[PDB]
Amino acid sequence: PIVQNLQGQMVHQAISPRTLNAWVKVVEEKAFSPEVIPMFSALSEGATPQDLNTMLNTVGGHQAAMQMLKETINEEAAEWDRLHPVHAGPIAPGQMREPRGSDIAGTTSTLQEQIGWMTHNPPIPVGEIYKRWIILGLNKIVRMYSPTSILDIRQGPKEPFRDYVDRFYKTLRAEQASQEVKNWMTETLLVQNANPDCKTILKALGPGATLEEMMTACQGVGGPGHKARVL
Amino acid sequence: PIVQNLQGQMVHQAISPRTLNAWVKVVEEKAFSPEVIPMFSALSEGATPQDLNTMLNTVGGHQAAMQMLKETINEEAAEWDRLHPVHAGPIAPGQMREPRGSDIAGTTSTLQEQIGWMTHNPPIPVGEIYKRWIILGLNKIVRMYSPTSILDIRQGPKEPFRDYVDRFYKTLRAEQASQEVKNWMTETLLVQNANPDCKTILKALGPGATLEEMMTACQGVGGPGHKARVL
Amino acid sequence: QGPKEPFRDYVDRFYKTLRAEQASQEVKNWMTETLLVQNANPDCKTILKALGPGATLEEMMTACQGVGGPGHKARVL
Amino acid sequence: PIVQNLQGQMVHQAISPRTLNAWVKVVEEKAFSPEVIPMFSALSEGATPQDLNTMLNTVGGHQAAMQMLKETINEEAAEWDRLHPVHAGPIAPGQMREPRGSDIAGTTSTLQEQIGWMTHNPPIPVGEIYKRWIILGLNKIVRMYSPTSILDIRQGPKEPFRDYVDRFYKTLRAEQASQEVKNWMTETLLVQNANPDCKTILKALGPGATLEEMMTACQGVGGPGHKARVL
Amino acid sequence: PIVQNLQGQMVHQAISPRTLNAWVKVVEEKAFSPEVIPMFSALSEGATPQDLNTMLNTVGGHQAAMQMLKETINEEAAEWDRLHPVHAGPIAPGQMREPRGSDIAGTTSTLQEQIGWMTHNPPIPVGEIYKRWIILGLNKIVRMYSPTSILDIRQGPKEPFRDYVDRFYKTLRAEQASQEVKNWMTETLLVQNANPDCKTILKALGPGATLEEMMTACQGVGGPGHKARVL
Amino acid sequence: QGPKEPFRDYVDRFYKTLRAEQASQEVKNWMTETLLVQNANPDCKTILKALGPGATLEEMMTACQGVGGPGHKARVL
């Protein structure tokens, strides 16, 4: 991808092998977790298609997941051949001709060509669009990965509050749903998926009690709360 | 390799020890894996033949595969000499004196001449052809490695679709065949080797189904179900 | 259509009869559409009903290929 | 149809009674047979749409299948105006009214006028497109009749190579697929549909053995029998 | 095909429906019998490749054997293409670029061009060469069909001399070999494969004399070596 | 929806309940998309799954009217 600002006009360098090794290593231990998605967004300096495509192609084990990302890229590219500029076609000689849907990615565009329209006239954000398509594919993958749904989780009698809460939050990252729905749901959901022993104090928090307020009390009573009768 | 762009003409800098060290480690963990072929494209930052040849020669363990790869390259080099624009005879001073098939090899052409046809005059794609010859030879090696011959992959009585699809994509990667043929085969072959219970689900899904739709369908609850019998 | 009569012999009786219908072309299309569902036997009617609205003769023929004689069970699962 | 060139300009002749008797006998004998499509091509001296439509309308037993063919012809006729060049109604006086989708059909044209657009100005291929539409329709009829399929050919222990070969190429009379597909599909099927004992001979002969070579080898093998060996 | 010379230039007419019905009918009644090959050769009036191809594809049930003939045509066309590259390439006005080996067969050349190179310029033997290749494929089919080999001929104790002679000449029809080799074998085999009782008489007749003379001698012998003299 | 409970009864109970829950309409419709097949009895649930994702309430209700109603002999009781 293109890098270099201080010395002047950008140069097309390849992604570091140390970064490439780190990417392969992360996939070994964190195969499908949602926590890897912002890491990818953060370190992808210059979202140049073939360079990024090479990262997908160097993945080990669960390569089947990469094939799903490729189908998503092709599908959004197919959408880009209709809803977005499909155009007249013809263009004057000595111009970069502008990209079609499959030209956004690495499918029909040669690597030098990709760099050209990202450096000659004001940049075409083909990499940003390609990155967005990969993120859309990742959203489908995490949703498919998640084993339990929101109402499936119901705390056992010998299970503690923290285990139940960890499972809920792990699940919540992969739900692919709106923040407003989450906040509105949060008021009633926490009491509903709890066990009978933990429910007593959890339900006692009452009106206007937020997560900090609830957690402070829950760490005070400890474990899964106490029994239903003192005798 | 010869590299540099903004500051001026390309300068010979030897390949980093990090790349060599990483290549040896990858060979130790997964010697014949298909992910090595994109890794080679990523690590070959400047396709100069003698420098590229170091990656081939530094491999210890599976030398017999490397010997076969070298033999395939020797044939491609011979084909380049006798079929792709055949060499003439003597030529006037101040020329590169166009490379023969044997000349392309690191044990034949000297570095001053070899770098010369890559930057003293408009570049000859000597690195691209050598790299391409290495890649199609590595395509032969992954085909040799294959434990399962595509059709060999089957689904047992207790083997879920998620385990089965992972195995199916893994065997498919080392195939070495056309996209149309694979597209035609994929829709029937997966169903053909499926277990009778899972085969009914695939039969029910039917025509107009894409991989994303099939994955979405395969995500939910399994087993036969619960509705009453009318017969 | 009878209890063990297949679509092949049932449809043939309709198409043979249809030749001597003597009526408007626009009306003939409109009449033809619900007839196959209406005059079918339970097993055949159930699969035709499953195909539902917007079906063409070519699509119905494609579906009817897999039935196997008059029928037995009108759904895969 | 319109024929004649040795005696001067073409004249519209009536369809032969000898050909009509043969057409009726072929339909009575074997209406859904695959050889009907080249036989129809062979029998069709002159391609005038209305005259050709006589053959379609003189149908006996397979009237229901023929009406599906009529529905397909109506779709192809719509495609002529909606997918292929639409042209326009206003045109210069004395022109042969540039044949529209409705005009091609025998049920929406006058014979004298139809002969006119096939002869007044450079010939419009109205008969050829109508013949192509009939062939496309007939191709569908085979798929709505066939009681055999590609992977549904199973060779029993007492079923000879002659019986198996006959059955195998019979299912390929209903294949209705591209040249690329049938050429590159056939080898897989030959060993797959063959009996376990027969597979031993086919595997031994292997790639490099043509259909003639395979036929020659199996002509020496003879019946499978209760014999211990294959020699 | 193009036919008729008496009234001036040749005209394109189809094959008679009575003849087409008879051709299909003879194939149905005689199947793989060697008598089909001279019938095809003798009654094929008008050697036009496009019509030869359609005529061949009117075969019913026993189509599997004809598939090997179709594969044989592919090989013979390629062999002719390899044999004559001599004039392939550029061309000047007043020529039709000549027919290539693959266009000899009516599967890539069009009817108008086929007629043109059989009536404009001095006729090219394209139909005759294509028919010759079809006959070669038919010769391969009869050899493949063959029920028994010439030294596998045996005459039982209750089997008449006439039955043995008929079976022997029937077997000699499918022998496909040089006249001298066949005559040399035929001369010694008559005594060799005869039953002991009949063989005793045939050995008494001994070497020499032609088929007419031998049949004249055998006219007074009869049966399977019957011990009465009822003739 | 119980073992032999009518589609008419099930929809009526759901709608009667639904207009007394005083909530955000966007949020309510969004869950209503999967609620109909989620609480359905196996027989009806099987038909709702045949219809599958997408389509209007009118399209779904149109299909449901055409398949008829319950049997009468039970098994869990």
Q: What is the DSSP string of A34-80?
A: TTHHHHHHHH--S--HHHHHHHHHT--S-THHHHHHHHHHHHHHHHT
Verify whether the Cβ–Cβ distance B225 to F42 is below 8 Å. yes
In DSSP terms, D3 is beta-bridged to D11
Instruction: Name the neighbours of C, counting chains with at least 3 Cβ pairs within 8 A.
Output: B, D, F
Phi, then psi, of A11 in degrees rounded to 5: -120, 140
Q: Which residues in chain B are closer than 8 Å to A8, comparing Cβ atoms?
A: 6
Verify whether the Cβ–Cβ distance F63 to C52 is below 8 Å. yes
Sign of the Cα pseudo-torsion (A128, A131, A136, A139, in order): negative
Tell which phi-psi region holds residue A198, choosing left (phi > 0), alpha (psi between -120 and 50) or beta. Answer: alpha
CA atoms of D106 and D104, how far apart (whole Å): 7
- How far is CA C61 from each of CA A56, A145, B107, F63, rounded to the nearest angstrom? 44, 40, 68, 22
Q: Which residues in chain F are closer than 8 Å to B226, comparing Cβ atoms?
A: 42
Phi, then psi, of D186 in degrees rounded to 5: -55, -45
Q: How many CA atoms lie within 13 A of E114 on its CB side?
A: 26
Residue E21 and residue E27 in contact, taking contact as beta carbons nearer than 8 Å: no
Vertex A102, ends A101 and A107: CA angle to 5°? 165
Give chain C's radius of gyration (CA, Å).
13
Sign of the Cα pseudo-torsion (D139, D143, D147, D148, in order): positive
- How far is CA A106 from each of CA A47, A84, B74, rounded to the nearest angstrom? 12, 18, 31
- State the amino acid at position D176 in one-letter form: Q
Element (H, E) at D23: helix D17-30
List the single residue in B203, B225, B231 with the smallest CB-CB distance to C76. Answer: B203
Vertex E92, ends E89 and E96: CA angle to 5°? 75
Q: Which residues in chain B are closer than 8 Å to A9, comparing Cβ atoms?
A: 6
Tell which phi-psi region holds residue E154, choosing left (phi > 0), alpha (psi between -120 and 50) or beta. Answer: beta
Asked if B228 reaches chain F (Cβ–Cβ under 8 Å), the answer is: yes
Go through A158-177 and write b for each residue having 16 or more CB atoms within 10 A of its CB, e for each that does not. ebbbeebbebbebbbebeee
The residue count of chain A comes to 231
Q: Which residues in chain A are closer than 8 Å to F30, comparing Cβ atoms?
A: 181
Q: Do chain E and chain F touch with ≥3 beta carbon pairs under 8 Å? A: no
- Non-local (6+) Cβ contacts of C43 within 8 A are C70, C71, C72, C73, C74
CA atoms of A144 and B218, how far apart (whole Å): 9
Q: Which residues in chain A are closer than 8 Å to F24, comparing Cβ atoms?
A: 184
Tokens 């092998």 correspond to A17
Tell which phi-psi region holds residue B9, choosing left (phi > 0), alpha (psi between -120 and 50) or beta. Answer: beta
Q: Mark out the alpha helices in chain B (DSSP H runs).
A: 17-30, 36-43, 49-58, 63-82, 111-119, 126-145, 161-172, 179-192, 196-205, 211-218
CA atoms of B213 and A152, how far apart (whole Å): 24
Burial class (CB in 10 A: 0-12, 13-18, 19+), A131: middle
CA atoms of E57 and E106, how far apart (whole Å): 12
Just give the CATH number of B1-147: 1.10.375.10
E12 by DSSP, 3-state: which? strand
Distance from CA of F47 to the nearest CA of B (A): 11
Vertex B175, ends B170 and B179: CA angle to 5°? 105
Tokens 């070969």 correspond to D165
Residue A162 and residue A136 in contact, taking contact as beta carbons nearer than 8 Å: no
Interface test with D, best of E10, E15, E57, E76 (most D CBs within 10 A): E57
The residue count of chain C comes to 77
Element (H, E) at F12: helix F7-18
- State the amino acid at position E33 in one-letter form: S
Phi, then psi, of D11 in degrees rounded to 5: -130, 140
- How far is CA B93 from each of CA A23, B97, B113, C20, E126, rounded to the nearest angstrom? 51, 9, 14, 94, 56
- Non-local (6+) Cβ contacts of D197 within 8 A are D157, D224, D230
The strand pair at B11-12 and E2-3 is best described as: unpaired
Q: How many CA atoms lie within 13 A of E135 on its CB side?
A: 14
Residue E1 and residue E47 in contact, taking contact as beta carbons nearer than 8 Å: yes
Give first-to-last CA distance, chain A, whole Å.
71
Tokens of E76: 């013979």
In DSSP terms, B11 is beta-bridged to B3
Long-range contacts of A117-123 (CB under 8 A, 24+ apart): A118/A2, A118/A48, A119/A2, A119/A9, A119/A10, A120/A96, A121/A96
In DSSP terms, E3 is beta-bridged to E11
CA atoms of D105 and D109, how far apart (whole Å): 7
Residue A119 and residue A10 in contact, taking contact as beta carbons nearer than 8 Å: yes
CA–centroid distance for F13 within its chain: 10
Which regions of chain B carry the CATH code 1.10.1200.30?
148-221
- How far is CA E161 from each of CA C43, E155, E222, rounded to the nearest angstrom? 65, 8, 7
- State the amino acid at position A197 in one-letter form: D
Verify whether the Cβ–Cβ distance A60 to B215 is below 8 Å. no
CA atoms of B60 and E32, how far apart (whole Å): 62
Q: Mark out the alpha helices in E44-178 (DSSP H runs).
A: 49-56, 63-83, 111-116, 126-145, 161-173
CA atoms of D15 and D21, how far apart (whole Å): 11
Verify whether the Cβ–Cβ distance C58 to D64 is below 8 Å. no
Sign of the Cα pseudo-torsion (A6, A10, A16, A19, in order): positive
DSSP state of D47: -
- Using CA coordinates, name the residue in chain B closest to D182: B181
CA atoms of A178 and A183, how far apart (whole Å): 9
Solved using = NMR
D2 by DSSP, 3-state: which? strand
Fold of C1-67: 1.10.1200
Go through C24-52 and write b for each residue having 16 or more CB atoms within 10 A of its CB, e for each that does not. eeeeeeeeeeeebbeebbebbbbbbeeee
- Using CA coordinates, name the residue in chain F closest to B216: F53
Sign of the Cα pseudo-torsion (D118, D123, D127, D129, in order): negative
CA atoms of C67 and D92, how far apart (whole Å): 56
Distance from CA of F27 to the nearest CA of A (A): 7
CA atoms of B4 and B178, how far apart (whole Å): 38
List, as one string, the DSSP characters of C27-50.
Answer: HHHHHHHHHHHHTS-HHHHHHHHH
- Using CA coordinates, name the residue in chain A closest to B216: A144
Residues 51-110 of D with CB under 8 A from C: 61, 63-64, 67-68, 71-72
Tokens of B44: 């070959």
Tokens of B222: 């399994």
Fold of B148-221: 1.10.1200
Which regions of chain E carry the CATH code 1.10.375.10?
1-147
Asked if C32 reaches chain D (Cβ–Cβ under 8 Å), the answer is: no
- Using CA coordinates, name the residue in chain B closest to D188: B151
E2 by DSSP, 3-state: which? strand
Verify whether the Cβ–Cβ distance B204 to C77 is below 8 Å. yes
Tokens 């596998």 correspond to E152
- How far is CA E178 from each of CA E181, E182, E183, rounded to the nearest angstrom? 5, 6, 9
Residue A106 and residue A49 in contact, taking contact as beta carbons nearer than 8 Å: yes
Q: Which residues in chain F are closer than 8 Å to B228, comparing Cβ atoms?
A: 42-43, 75
Asked if B18 reaches chain F (Cβ–Cβ under 8 Å), the answer is: no
Phi, then psi, of A12 in degrees rounded to 5: -90, 100
- Using CA coordinates, name the residue in chain D closest to E21: D22
CA atoms of E169 and E167, how far apart (whole Å): 6
Residue A197 and residue A157 in contact, taking contact as beta carbons nearer than 8 Å: yes
Residue A17 and residue B16 in contact, taking contact as beta carbons nearer than 8 Å: yes
The strand pair at A2-3 and A11-12 is best described as: antiparallel
- State the amino acid at position B214 in one-letter form: M
- Non-local (6+) Cβ contacts of B89 within 8 A are none
In total, the C-beta contacts within 8 angstroms joining chain B to chain F are: 10
The strand pair at A11-12 and B2-3 is best described as: unpaired
Q: How many CA atoms lie within 13 A of E182 on its CB side?
A: 11
B117 by DSSP, 3-state: which? helix
CA atoms of B155 and E82, how far apart (whole Å): 48
- Non-local (6+) Cβ contacts of B54 within 8 A are B15, B20
Residues 102-161 of D with CB under 8 A from E: none
Q: How many CA atoms lie within 13 A of B16 on its CB side?
A: 12
Q: Which residues in chain E are closer than 8 Å to D6, comparing Cβ atoms?
A: 4, 7-9, 11
